Amino acid sequence: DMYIERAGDITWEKDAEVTGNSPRLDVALDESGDFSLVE
Amino acid sequence: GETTDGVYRVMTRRLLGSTQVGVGVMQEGVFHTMWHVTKGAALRSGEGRLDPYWGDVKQDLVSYCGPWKLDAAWDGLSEVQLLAVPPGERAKNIQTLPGIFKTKDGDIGAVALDYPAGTSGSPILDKCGRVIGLYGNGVVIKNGSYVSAITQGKRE
Ligand SMILES: CNc1nccc2ccccc12
């Protein structure tokens, strides 16, 4: 039995930690909703 | 139960202790999460019950109490924020410039940020605070790193 608990508001935070890269990837999406890499 | 707009953890008592299996967004009275978090099961909110209303395994999305309400889209240029809600940890905003998933049916934005599986369903936001998609369905690239699609539904 699953339940939900509030965790916060949805708002843009000014001066948040900025991280992560921006890769451009060729992918495929199967009928089961799974993404895979296409080479 | 609690119907206030916002971000929520999705918990279960089935396994050892209380375990966070995902996250979701309550907006306009509807709860939105990824299909792989709930597998379409009903949810509890305090004393109330939320029943699935719409879902699709291929999009990997599900809405409860009503139709999918989130319609904002990544503009393809701007930085966005993942409002990550990790298990046992406080909600935190992380700003990033999305990459791209290129498919035979078009391109989708993607965020290269690595969080535990129980963070699936955490919303990705634009500068106006609008939810442009949910985090948690993606791929593991060459170096073992995780890249999630910016998954968005359709508002009928
Ligand atoms: C292979 N699966 C995963 N690995 C790492 C982080 C993840 C975050 C959300 C959903 C799945 C994830």
The CATH number assigned to the domain holding B10 equals 2.40.10.120
Q: Is B145 a catalytic residue?
A: no
Instruction: For residue B12, give the amino acid letter.
Output: T
Pairing mode, if any, of strands B123-125 and B61-64? Answer: unpaired
Give residue B117's domain range.
80-149
Q: Which of B36, B44, B113 sits opposite A1 (nearest CB)?
A: B44
Residue identifier of the C-alpha nearest atom 2 of ligand 1: B117
Residue B130 CA: distances (Å) to CA of A5, B53, B70, B121, B152? 21, 22, 8, 15, 12
On whether both B88 and B45 belong to a single domain, the answer is no
CA neighbor of B97 nearest in space, from A16, A10, A8, A11: A16
On whether both B44 and B97 belong to a single domain, the answer is no
On whether both B30 and B86 belong to a single domain, the answer is no
Resolution of the determined structure in angstroms stands at 1.8
**C-alpha–C-alpha distance, residues B73 and B86, integer Å:** 24
User: What number of other Cβ atoms are within 10 A of residue B142's Cβ?
Assistant: 9
On whether both B56 and B101 belong to a single domain, the answer is no
**C-alpha–C-alpha distance, residues B59 and B124, integer Å:** 16
Considering the candidates B32, B63, B120, B122, report the single residue annotated as catalytic.
B120
Domain count, chain B: 2
**C-alpha–C-alpha distance, residues B156 and B68, integer Å:** 8
Domain assignment present for residue B13? The answer is yes
Q: Is B36 a catalytic residue?
A: yes
- Indicate which technique resolved this structure: X-ray
Check: CB of residue B60 under 8 Å from CB of residue B149: no
Which of B36, B111, B146 is the best mutation target for the ligand 1 pocket, counting ligand atoms within 8 Å of the beta carbon and taking the most?
Answer: B146
User: What number of other Cβ atoms are within 10 A of residue B50's Cβ?
Assistant: 23
